[PDB]
Amino acid sequence: DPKELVGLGAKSYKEKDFTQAKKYFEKACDLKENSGCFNLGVLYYQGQGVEKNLKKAASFYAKACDLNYSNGCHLLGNLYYSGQGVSQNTNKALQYYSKACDLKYAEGCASLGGIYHDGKVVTRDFKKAVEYFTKACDLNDGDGCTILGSLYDAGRGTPKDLKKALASYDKACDLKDSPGCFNAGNMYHHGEGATKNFKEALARYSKACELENGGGCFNLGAMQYNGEGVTRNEKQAIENFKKGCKLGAKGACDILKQLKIKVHH
Template identity: 45%
Template sequence: MKKIVFILVLLLGVSLSDGYAEHNKGSKQKESELYKKACDGGYVRGCYILGLLYDIGDGVKQNKQKASELYKKACDGGDMSGCYNLGLLYYDGDGVRQNKQKAKELYKKACDGGNMRGCYNLGFLYDIGDGVKQNKQKASQLYKKACDGGHMVGCSSLGNLYSNGDGVKQNKQKAKELFEKACDGGDMKGCYNLGLLYYDGDGVKQNKKKAKKLYKKTCDGGDIGGCFILGVLYDNGDGVRQNKQKAKKLYKKACDGGNMRGCYNLGVLYYDGDGIRQNKQKAKELFEKACDGGHMGGCSNLGLLYAIGGGVRQNKQKAKELFGKACDRGLNSGCKNYKILNEQGY
């Protein structure tokens, strides 16, 4: 679970005010000393901030165990951010022994105390049944609480439940409203999901131009999935004027960001020389990256290159291994090609 942490410096008292000034001067060691003094003096927010410094190694040597102790002190003193961050450590087993039940309890305490990130994370556990019995209805309630409290990812996640009818009665209009709220609030997954509704005409009037704008916003906002989908639109001329060069750039951005479908599609462009200069060696590298990243189409296409000697030295044994890998993960074309090579004695 991705950790989201914020340094919220409350200028209450001379010590924290001085600490903030020292931070602006770049004296992070002095800053940590002042937060320690505040913590030792009973100001639990100082304990939380000092724990955060140890957690991320900012001005002090990173020490997750020390961070957990300080978060606990903050949490016990009523600082809900301390409870939330301690829950993150227990969830990941980071500096403490992994204990998802403990993480759940801490998220609940944080949520009950008004920390919306705690509500969202607790909802996520119930949504996927991680450390708790899966309960989509409970997840929907917690996502709603988070959303109402200004947590935009909670809005987007609640929108997903309404879109699919999970734990709530299916309501595409409600899903659309929640995705809009999330998107307007800066959550790129909300923009992405709203784009899907407009692209498919799912509960809304189909509008591919609107979908394209939302995918662009998503991509520009750092959500790589949006870059990939936008690349597909330009690749196929779907709702936009076909532009293979634009598709190439978007697939590359997606691939560089870890989206293996982007790597695969970019590999196809290079192999076919479709709107770009053909480069089978580059295609091979991209299929290899996609395959290593878990995209079985990449494994299958890499197998084809080795089977025919396309951009690589022909190696049918290697091809068979790659087809077998794809087949084992459920790709039918991999199974068929594996069978062909097996019958040929490879």
């Protein structure tokens, strides 16, 4: 029944019948349905079906977190971190992010890795940053894998290991993180973390370029312009160069200015 109540509330929510949605979520949360409490918190946060009040939203996220709804722990972590809805409190933020992470919520692990990595609200700790980003990456957080990749490459908080760096970037690439495909391509093109393989670098750069990564299209164009990866091609390599420049790849813009050699009429 409680599960069904949340479903009815979600349906009313989609129809923008926030009043009824609130009634269903209230009933579900009273019956200890964690997603019901969470959704109720969202309504107070957005002022939908009720006057906006982020402090009340926080109390409902707290109820959801007590009922082990990882997403509830994470948003509460964000509220304490920024002092939104409740007073700023780093200690509590770390506490809630940590539970979200223990409950397998990738973003929670990522937030913690980012905090210990930047060392703004806490003393920088690359060691912990690696541990949390390792958890985030194992939980499929694309950006987390990429950051973890950079830690392995730099050897911060962990032994410098180009092979692990590449694996992280590669996974990040599978997770659709273009920066990951970019770095992965670079390593494959420079023979770092693995034997030089223009073929692999080509696939990486292509995926990165497809994901709208400027440097991805640019480096991909250079591959073709020098016939490194594939056979050889300039009329199509200049195509990727334009896209790179469009996406922001400066090297692509300039290089394009020197490839303006064509028969005129």
